Scaffold this motif. Structure first.
Motif, PDB file in Angstrom:
ATOM      1  N   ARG D   1       0.825  -1.200   0.000  1.00  0.00           N
ATOM      2  CA  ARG D   1       0.000   0.000   0.000  1.00  0.00           C
ATOM      3  C   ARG D   1       0.863   1.254   0.000  1.00  0.00           C
ATOM      4  NH1 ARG D   1      -1.915   3.147   4.354  1.00  0.00           N
ATOM      5  NH2 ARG D   1      -3.688   4.469   3.763  1.00  0.00           N
ATOM      6  N   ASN D   2       1.880   1.273   0.855  1.00  0.00           N
ATOM      7  CA  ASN D   2       2.841   2.366   0.914  1.00  0.00           C
ATOM      8  C   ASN D   2       4.176   1.871   0.378  1.00  0.00           C
ATOM      9  OD1 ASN D   2       2.938   0.609   3.042  1.00  0.00           O
ATOM     10  ND2 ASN D   2       2.831   2.177   4.643  1.00  0.00           N
ATOM     11  N   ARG D   3       4.663   2.514  -0.678  1.00  0.00           N
ATOM     12  CA  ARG D   3       5.884   2.108  -1.351  1.00  0.00           C
ATOM     13  C   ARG D   3       6.973   3.150  -1.146  1.00  0.00           C
ATOM     14  NH1 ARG D   3       6.529   1.678  -6.191  1.00  0.00           N
ATOM     15  NH2 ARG D   3       5.711   3.730  -6.789  1.00  0.00           N
ATOM     16  N   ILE D   4       8.218   2.690  -1.162  1.00  0.00           N
ATOM     17  CA  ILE D   4       9.381   3.570  -1.149  1.00  0.00           C
ATOM     18  C   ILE D   4       9.748   3.868  -2.600  1.00  0.00           C
ATOM     19  CG2 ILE D   4      11.696   3.929  -0.280  1.00  0.00           C
ATOM     20  CD1 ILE D   4      11.226   1.800   1.764  1.00  0.00           C
ATOM     21  N   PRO D   5       9.701   5.125  -3.038  1.00  0.00           N
ATOM     22  CA  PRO D   5       9.967   5.422  -4.450  1.00  0.00           C
ATOM     23  C   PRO D   5      11.383   5.038  -4.849  1.00  0.00           C
ATOM     24  CG  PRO D   5       9.954   7.428  -3.150  1.00  0.00           C
ATOM     25  CD  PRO D   5       9.442   6.343  -2.255  1.00  0.00           C
ATOM     26  N   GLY D   6      11.512   4.508  -6.063  1.00  0.00           N
ATOM     27  CA  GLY D   6      12.799   4.096  -6.581  1.00  0.00           C
ATOM     28  C   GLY D   6      13.402   2.970  -5.763  1.00  0.00           C
ATOM     29  N   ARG D   7      14.728   2.964  -5.691  1.00  0.00           N
ATOM     30  CA  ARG D   7      15.421   2.032  -4.818  1.00  0.00           C
ATOM     31  C   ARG D   7      15.336   2.519  -3.378  1.00  0.00           C
ATOM     32  NH1 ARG D   7      18.655  -2.017  -6.868  1.00  0.00           N
ATOM     33  NH2 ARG D   7      19.940  -3.119  -5.328  1.00  0.00           N
ATOM     34  N   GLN D   8      15.276   1.570  -2.450  1.00  0.00           N
ATOM     35  CA  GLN D   8      14.932   1.869  -1.067  1.00  0.00           C
ATOM     36  C   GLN D   8      16.120   2.300  -0.215  1.00  0.00           C
ATOM     37  OE1 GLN D   8      13.456  -1.567   0.978  1.00  0.00           O
ATOM     38  NE2 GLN D   8      15.092  -2.914   0.240  1.00  0.00           N
ATOM     39  N   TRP D   9      17.327   2.363  -0.776  1.00  0.00           N
ATOM     40  CA  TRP D   9      18.488   2.777  -0.003  1.00  0.00           C
ATOM     41  C   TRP D   9      19.299   3.888  -0.654  1.00  0.00           C
ATOM     42  CZ3 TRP D   9      17.936   1.200   4.669  1.00  0.00           C
ATOM     43  CH2 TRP D   9      17.375  -0.050   4.944  1.00  0.00           C
ATOM     44  N   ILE D  10      18.931   4.337  -1.850  1.00  0.00           N
ATOM     45  CA  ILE D  10      19.661   5.390  -2.541  1.00  0.00           C
ATOM     46  C   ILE D  10      18.676   6.446  -3.017  1.00  0.00           C
ATOM     47  CG2 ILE D  10      21.443   3.768  -3.273  1.00  0.00           C
ATOM     48  CD1 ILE D  10      20.277   3.751  -6.011  1.00  0.00           C
ATOM     49  N   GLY D  11      19.177   7.656  -3.207  1.00  0.00           N
ATOM     50  CA  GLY D  11      18.393   8.748  -3.743  1.00  0.00           C
ATOM     51  C   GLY D  11      17.978   9.736  -2.667  1.00  0.00           C
ATOM     52  N   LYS D  12      17.125  10.677  -3.078  1.00  0.00           N
ATOM     53  CA  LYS D  12      16.625  11.686  -2.149  1.00  0.00           C
ATOM     54  C   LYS D  12      15.745  11.064  -1.073  1.00  0.00           C
ATOM     55  CE  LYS D  12      15.070  15.494  -3.861  1.00  0.00           C
ATOM     56  NZ  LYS D  12      14.188  16.436  -4.603  1.00  0.00           N
ATOM     57  N   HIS D  13      14.867  10.142  -1.458  1.00  0.00           N
ATOM     58  CA  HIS D  13      13.946   9.498  -0.531  1.00  0.00           C
ATOM     59  C   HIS D  13      14.429   8.080  -0.257  1.00  0.00           C
ATOM     60  CE1 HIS D  13      10.818  12.408  -2.408  1.00  0.00           C
ATOM     61  NE2 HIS D  13      11.414  12.975  -1.376  1.00  0.00           N
ATOM     62  N   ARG D  14      14.660   7.771   1.012  1.00  0.00           N
ATOM     63  CA  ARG D  14      15.192   6.483   1.426  1.00  0.00           C
ATOM     64  C   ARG D  14      14.240   5.826   2.421  1.00  0.00           C
ATOM     65  NH1 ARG D  14      21.778   7.416   2.266  1.00  0.00           N
ATOM     66  NH2 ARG D  14      22.110   8.524   0.291  1.00  0.00           N
ATOM     67  N   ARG D  15      14.668   4.697   2.953  1.00  0.00           N
ATOM     68  CA  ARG D  15      13.923   3.984   3.976  1.00  0.00           C
ATOM     69  C   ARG D  15      14.190   4.606   5.345  1.00  0.00           C
ATOM     70  NH1 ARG D  15      13.891  -2.654   4.460  1.00  0.00           N
ATOM     71  NH2 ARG D  15      13.148  -2.763   6.622  1.00  0.00           N
ATOM     72  N   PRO D  16      13.176   4.691   6.204  1.00  0.00           N
ATOM     73  CA  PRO D  16      13.347   5.389   7.488  1.00  0.00           C
ATOM     74  C   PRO D  16      14.035   4.567   8.568  1.00  0.00           C
ATOM     75  CG  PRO D  16      11.082   5.548   6.658  1.00  0.00           C
ATOM     76  CD  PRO D  16      11.759   4.471   5.886  1.00  0.00           C
ATOM     77  N   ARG D  17      14.738   3.495   8.184  1.00  0.00           N
ATOM     78  CA  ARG D  17      15.400   2.562   9.096  1.00  0.00           C
ATOM     79  C   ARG D  17      16.107   3.270  10.246  1.00  0.00           C
ATOM     80  NH1 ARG D  17      20.876  -0.961   7.562  1.00  0.00           N
ATOM     81  NH2 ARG D  17      21.225  -1.781   9.670  1.00  0.00           N
ATOM     82  N   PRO D  18      15.671   3.053  11.482  1.00  0.00           N
ATOM     83  CA  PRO D  18      16.242   3.768  12.623  1.00  0.00           C
ATOM     84  C   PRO D  18      17.406   3.011  13.254  1.00  0.00           C
ATOM     85  CG  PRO D  18      14.349   2.546  13.351  1.00  0.00           C
ATOM     86  CD  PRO D  18      14.520   2.225  11.879  1.00  0.00           C
ATOM     87  N   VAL D  19      18.119   3.715  14.129  1.00  0.00           N
ATOM     88  CA  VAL D  19      19.215   3.123  14.884  1.00  0.00           C
ATOM     89  C   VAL D  19      18.647   2.390  16.092  1.00  0.00           C
ATOM     90  CG1 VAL D  19      19.530   5.345  16.023  1.00  0.00           C
ATOM     91  CG2 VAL D  19      21.328   3.617  16.164  1.00  0.00           C
ATOM     92  N   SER D  20      19.193   1.213  16.376  1.00  0.00           N
ATOM     93  CA  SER D  20      18.686   0.351  17.431  1.00  0.00           C
ATOM     94  C   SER D  20      19.538   0.475  18.688  1.00  0.00           C
ATOM     95  CB  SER D  20      18.649  -1.103  16.960  1.00  0.00           C
ATOM     96  OG  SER D  20      18.167  -1.954  17.984  1.00  0.00           O
ATOM     97  N   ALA D  21      19.008  -0.066  19.787  1.00  0.00           N
ATOM     98  CA  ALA D  21      19.750  -0.065  21.042  1.00  0.00           C
ATOM     99  C   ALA D  21      20.996  -0.934  20.960  1.00  0.00           C
ATOM    100  CB  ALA D  21      18.850  -0.533  22.186  1.00  0.00           C
ATOM    101  N   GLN D  22      20.946  -2.016  20.181  1.00  0.00           N
ATOM    102  CA  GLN D  22      22.130  -2.849  20.000  1.00  0.00           C
ATOM    103  C   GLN D  22      23.225  -2.094  19.259  1.00  0.00           C
ATOM    104  OE1 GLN D  22      24.560  -5.806  20.721  1.00  0.00           O
ATOM    105  NE2 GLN D  22      22.413  -5.928  21.363  1.00  0.00           N
ATOM    106  N   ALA D  23      22.846  -1.275  18.277  1.00  0.00           N
ATOM    107  CA  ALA D  23      23.839  -0.533  17.505  1.00  0.00           C
ATOM    108  C   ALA D  23      24.547   0.510  18.361  1.00  0.00           C
ATOM    109  CB  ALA D  23      23.181   0.124  16.294  1.00  0.00           C
ATOM    110  N   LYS D  24      23.827   1.137  19.293  1.00  0.00           N
ATOM    111  CA  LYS D  24      24.456   2.119  20.172  1.00  0.00           C
ATOM    112  C   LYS D  24      25.534   1.476  21.036  1.00  0.00           C
ATOM    113  CE  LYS D  24      20.232   4.900  20.509  1.00  0.00           C
ATOM    114  NZ  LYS D  24      19.217   5.448  21.447  1.00  0.00           N
ATOM    115  N   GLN D  25      25.267   0.277  21.557  1.00  0.00           N
ATOM    116  CA  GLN D  25      26.252  -0.396  22.395  1.00  0.00           C
ATOM    117  C   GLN D  25      27.489  -0.797  21.603  1.00  0.00           C
ATOM    118  OE1 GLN D  25      26.122  -0.695  25.766  1.00  0.00           O
ATOM    119  NE2 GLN D  25      28.247  -1.374  25.507  1.00  0.00           N
ATOM    120  N   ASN D  26      27.316  -1.206  20.344  1.00  0.00           N
ATOM    121  CA  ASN D  26      28.468  -1.567  19.524  1.00  0.00           C
ATOM    122  C   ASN D  26      29.381  -0.369  19.307  1.00  0.00           C
ATOM    123  OD1 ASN D  26      27.690  -4.265  19.239  1.00  0.00           O
ATOM    124  ND2 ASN D  26      26.446  -3.826  17.425  1.00  0.00           N
TER     125      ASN D  26
END
Ligand SMILES: [K+]
Ligand SMILES: [K+]
Ligand SMILES: [K+]
Ligand SMILES: [K+]
Ligand SMILES: [K+]
Ligand SMILES: [K+]
Ligand SMILES: [K+]
Ligand SMILES: [K+]
Ligand SMILES: [K+]
Ligand SMILES: [K+]
Ligand SMILES: [Mg+2]
Ligand SMILES: [Mg+2]
Ligand SMILES: [Mg+2]
Ligand SMILES: [Mg+2]
Ligand SMILES: [Mg+2]
Ligand SMILES: [Mg+2]
Ligand SMILES: [Mg+2]
Ligand SMILES: [Mg+2]
Ligand SMILES: [Mg+2]
Ligand SMILES: [Mg+2]
Ligand SMILES: [Mg+2]
Ligand SMILES: [Mg+2]
Ligand SMILES: [Mg+2]
Ligand SMILES: [Mg+2]
Ligand SMILES: [Mg+2]
Ligand SMILES: [Mg+2]
Ligand SMILES: [Mg+2]
Ligand SMILES: [Mg+2]
Ligand SMILES: [Mg+2]
Ligand SMILES: [Mg+2]
Ligand SMILES: [Mg+2]
Ligand SMILES: [Mg+2]
Ligand SMILES: [Mg+2]
Ligand SMILES: [Mg+2]
Ligand SMILES: [Mg+2]
Ligand SMILES: [Mg+2]
Ligand SMILES: [Mg+2]
Ligand SMILES: [Mg+2]
Ligand SMILES: [Mg+2]
Ligand SMILES: [Mg+2]
Ligand SMILES: [Mg+2]
Ligand SMILES: [Mg+2]
Ligand SMILES: [Mg+2]
Ligand SMILES: [Mg+2]
Ligand SMILES: [Mg+2]
Ligand SMILES: [Mg+2]
Ligand SMILES: [Mg+2]
Ligand SMILES: [Mg+2]
Ligand SMILES: [Mg+2]
Ligand SMILES: [Mg+2]
Ligand SMILES: [Mg+2]
Ligand SMILES: [Mg+2]
Ligand SMILES: [Mg+2]
Ligand SMILES: [Mg+2]
Ligand SMILES: [Mg+2]
Ligand SMILES: [Mg+2]
Ligand SMILES: [Mg+2]
Ligand SMILES: [Mg+2]
Ligand SMILES: [Mg+2]
Ligand SMILES: [Mg+2]
Ligand SMILES: [Mg+2]
Ligand SMILES: [Mg+2]
Ligand SMILES: [Mg+2]
Lengths: 50, 118, 31, 94, 49
Positions: D1-26
């Motif tokens: 229903r909701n699509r990410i325009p173009g490729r989902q990791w490059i361009g002006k509009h990307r995926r909203p993938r957030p930083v996790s608690a595990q990533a902060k500890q690393n």
RNA sequence: UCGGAGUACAAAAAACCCUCCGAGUGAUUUUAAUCUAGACAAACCAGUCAAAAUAACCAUAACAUCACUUAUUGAUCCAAAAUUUUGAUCAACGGAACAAGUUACCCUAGGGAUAACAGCGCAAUCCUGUUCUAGAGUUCCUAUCGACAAUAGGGUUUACGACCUCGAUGUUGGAUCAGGACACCCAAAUGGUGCAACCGCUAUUAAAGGUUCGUUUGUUCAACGAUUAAAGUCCUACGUGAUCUGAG
RNA sequence: GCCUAACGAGCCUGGUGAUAGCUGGUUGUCCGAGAAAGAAUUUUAGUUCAACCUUAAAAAUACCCCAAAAACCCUAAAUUCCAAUGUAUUUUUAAGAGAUAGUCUAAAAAGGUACAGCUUUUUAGAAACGGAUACAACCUUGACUAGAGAGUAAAAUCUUAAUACUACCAUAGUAGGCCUAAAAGCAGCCAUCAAUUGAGAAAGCGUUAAAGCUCAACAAAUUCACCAACAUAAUCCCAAAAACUAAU
RNA sequence: GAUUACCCCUUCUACCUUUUGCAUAAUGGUUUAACCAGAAAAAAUCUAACAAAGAGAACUUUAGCUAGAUACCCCGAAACCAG
């Protein structure tokens, strides 16, 4: 903006990491980020970032 | 443009509390390094690859001993984010020619001259 | 050179005035 | 229903993938290690002047050994046993 | 796992590292004469020397 | 084609149908020789400097000058002149000795490396809602509207890009059948009014059903006649030609 | 137009194995090393040089590289050059082909809409059989074979979804002067004194002007009270679910 | 991969060509047998004969000469000319 910067209880700050090139972060950061101290991103200024 | 990073000399000034935290000696600096590579040379610039190659750190997780002279320290500061550095401790002192084959290097960073006697 | 401590040792244009040349079209006694 | 325009990791509009608690500890674990890295490099045992040519005979000898080994490159000896050993192909039981 | 605990106690992070479980010979003759040394152990004692 | 400044901020190099200046030579006399170490530059061809030595002349004399001085120029072959020397808007300027148009009568080898139709990216253009009140509204900002401006989102139009297809993704309108969205034309419920009632204007909620027949044009669109509770907006390869039509 | 079922010029044979920078094809095993484009070109669908690289050979120095050093108005990240040191690389000679149609991410710029999975250059990176559910470009990773051993790296559900402000009470000079058709706190101008313990020649509403309502000041009385509100798309929503038994 | 057990379970986006990038909805192939596509020795490197000389004439020679071995494809146009 100075009291909130003097009493920060977080050991790591953008100024310390960027200038010392920790984790090889200079490959991601811009040369202007050394002066901006991470408070400026493009034309956007976030005053809450220490 | 992406170029080399110049590390200011203010970073390498230790606080008085640093010595107590890391177990260093306030008066006498240690004599030898133990350098172990952690991360990969891939996705890093070419000048960092050569410094890793010329320090004998090609294989990861293999300890390598280097001097503490400024000439070696100049190269380590460039790749200080890819290696782990610990001092070399000598509980029994330097090995002699009789005990060369019985030496073992523990994980905590000390060299035991006589290992598993008899 | 910029980074050398001896930078700007040859600076002289701030010692003499600008001495605007009397241009052919701009020649006028602007007092 | 909701699509990410173009490729989902490059361009002006990307995926909203957030930083996790595990990533902060690393990140913190790597920062603590590198904080110790720049302390052991702070105080050298010898100064810049005291290391001026302290180990140069070994460096000179190491280069001389490299020249000697690289200068020995030459075809190997050829002997009679190699040529006369081919006649053993047709050895028989009389 | 628990490699952090082993490093705290002085042992190797990996239980295969210079422990008594690795250095000692794994087999010997029944009569009691020593077995020939392992290929791995001899190599490991050459890089340490 | 050649030079200067910026893009190219500090050794060199560095692009665009990128932003600005120029050159295709004049003036003058000091008319500027021969021979050779070492170098800059560079794919090549070319371009640049140059000590010592010899001759010229103060009798132990070599930088022609000025105009941003930097550019003011052309390879072989060939031709002409004494043998010394000269010769091209060969400017398509590393230069074929000398050669234009049209093809919808077209043919062949290829390209989605490259256009038209379609998708996709993006949102200038377009559309929808909100923030801000100067004012229009006789008085009265926000019943109905709202200039100069702020902000968020939709992906219908014309563009922009050239990413999948040119050993084929068949292209307008109708006919048949319709699937879906709600930013609702009607039907149902309700708030506000400069709402007495009637007829209206405006806002919230709701998509199960419905949304006419004709004259002209190939027409979608638009105009006009008659009517209806209403003759909605848009997506679907601007649905649907292995179902039809071919007027354009 | 037609000249034996293809006529912008018949068919057959020979020249003919015409020639194609263009498309397609190119047949056993295993092993070693392994390249993304600078310059000319009727040249950008191709070639010939340079760089890089492969095979063989000779030789000595190559990378990292401190101090010193490199422009005059202002100017960042940083380059050039170089001893030590760490490390084995580099140069030269003799044979060579491929490639010369590039994609994204981070950084410095330019054109554009401070648009594009857009385009033109410079520095750096990558093209996992793991992770980001799927995934060329992002992150972890020194790519051998066998094992029903072990330790670790990147990494798996992201935050807030916020705003009640309610008593009681009003009397003097005085329509202050001016102004206007009328200007009584309340078009404008000017002044802004003064009764009462208490109340502004007035903060708002209202009147044609008045009148009137309300707010400041009396008393009464005492939880706290700056600010933080933002609509929707088209085939059918999209792992299922969970606020505490001990987590560097 | 396995498994007492064919499936059931777990893990894997056909193959060539062409491209910056193809499971791609880009190209070609129904399958089988037979047939069908790298060729040249000037300079060079390797091995050997003889050596200031070599070669069974004619040539090359300031360590050279003579001999051997190591090399560079297939299919296809529209056309052009003569009889
Ligand atoms: K995108
Ligand atoms: K030309
Ligand atoms: K656009
Ligand atoms: K096509
Ligand atoms: K409907
Ligand atoms: K071509
Ligand atoms: K008044
Ligand atoms: K096709
Ligand atoms: K093709
Ligand atoms: K094929
Ligand atoms: Mg997509
Ligand atoms: Mg992201
Ligand atoms: Mg040069
Ligand atoms: Mg001279
Ligand atoms: Mg010629
Ligand atoms: Mg040209
Ligand atoms: Mg040129
Ligand atoms: Mg010619
Ligand atoms: Mg016609
Ligand atoms: Mg054709
Ligand atoms: Mg291309
Ligand atoms: Mg179509
Ligand atoms: Mg299109
Ligand atoms: Mg399509
Ligand atoms: Mg948008
Ligand atoms: Mg008004
Ligand atoms: Mg907008
Ligand atoms: Mg394309
Ligand atoms: Mg392109
Ligand atoms: Mg097909
Ligand atoms: Mg229809
Ligand atoms: Mg329907
Ligand atoms: Mg609605
Ligand atoms: Mg209704
Ligand atoms: Mg259609
Ligand atoms: Mg149709
Ligand atoms: Mg049909
Ligand atoms: Mg169809
Ligand atoms: Mg017709
Ligand atoms: Mg015929
Ligand atoms: Mg051919
Ligand atoms: Mg190119
Ligand atoms: Mg070449
Ligand atoms: Mg220096
Ligand atoms: Mg050097
Ligand atoms: Mg090319
Ligand atoms: Mg590109
Ligand atoms: Mg691009
Ligand atoms: Mg690059
Ligand atoms: Mg994966
Ligand atoms: Mg390995
Ligand atoms: Mg009151
Ligand atoms: Mg709405
Ligand atoms: Mg579900
Ligand atoms: Mg794929
Ligand atoms: Mg393509
Ligand atoms: Mg290619
Ligand atoms: Mg296919
Ligand atoms: Mg094709
Ligand atoms: Mg087929
Ligand atoms: Mg030959
Ligand atoms: Mg001809
Ligand atoms: Mg003929």
């Amino acid at each position: 903006q100075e009291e909130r910067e003097r009493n920060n209880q977080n050991p790591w700050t953008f100024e310390r990491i960027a200038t010392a090139n920790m984790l090889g972060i200079r490959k991601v950061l811009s040369p202007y980020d050394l002066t901006h101290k991470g408070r400026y991103w493009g034309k956007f200024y976030t005053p809450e970032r220490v | 443009k992406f170029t080399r990073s110049r590390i200011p000399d203010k970073v390498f000034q230790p606080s008085p509390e640093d010595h107590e935290k890391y177990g260093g000696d306030p008066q006498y600096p240690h004599k030898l390094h133990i350098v172990t590579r952690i991360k990969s040379t891939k996705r890093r610039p070419y000048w960092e690859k050569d410094i890793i190659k010329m320090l004998g750190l090609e294989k990861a997780h293999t300890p390598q001993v280097h001097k503490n002279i400024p000439s070696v320290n100049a190269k380590l500061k460039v790749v200080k984010h890819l290696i782990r550095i610990k001092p070399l401790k000598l509980p029994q002192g330097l090995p002699t020619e009789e005990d060369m084959a019985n030496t073992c290097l523990k994980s905590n960073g000390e060299l035991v001259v006589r290992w598993l006697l008899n | 050179y910029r980074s050398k401590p001896t930078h700007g040792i040859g600076r002289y244009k701030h010692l003499v005035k600008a001495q605007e040349p009397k241009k052919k079209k701009g020649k006028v006694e602007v007092r | 229903r909701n699509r990410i325009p173009g490729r989902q990791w490059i361009g002006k509009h990307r995926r909203p993938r957030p930083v996790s608690a595990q990533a902060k500890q690393n990140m913190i674990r790597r920062l603590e290690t590198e904080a110790e890295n720049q302390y052991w490099l702070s105080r050298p045992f010898l100064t810049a002047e005291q290391e001026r040519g302290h180990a140069a005979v070994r460096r000179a000898a190491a280069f001389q050994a490299l020249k000697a080994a690289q200068a020995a490159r030459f075809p190997a000896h050829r002997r009679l046993e190699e040529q006369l050993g081919h006649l053993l192909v047709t050895r028989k039981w009389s | 796992a628990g490699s952090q605990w082993r490093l705290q106690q002085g042992f190797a992070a990996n239980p295969s590292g210079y422990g008594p479980l690795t250095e000692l010979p794994d087999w010997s003759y029944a009569d009691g004469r020593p077995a020939p040394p392992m290929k791995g152990q001899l190599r490991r004692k050459a890089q340490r020397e």
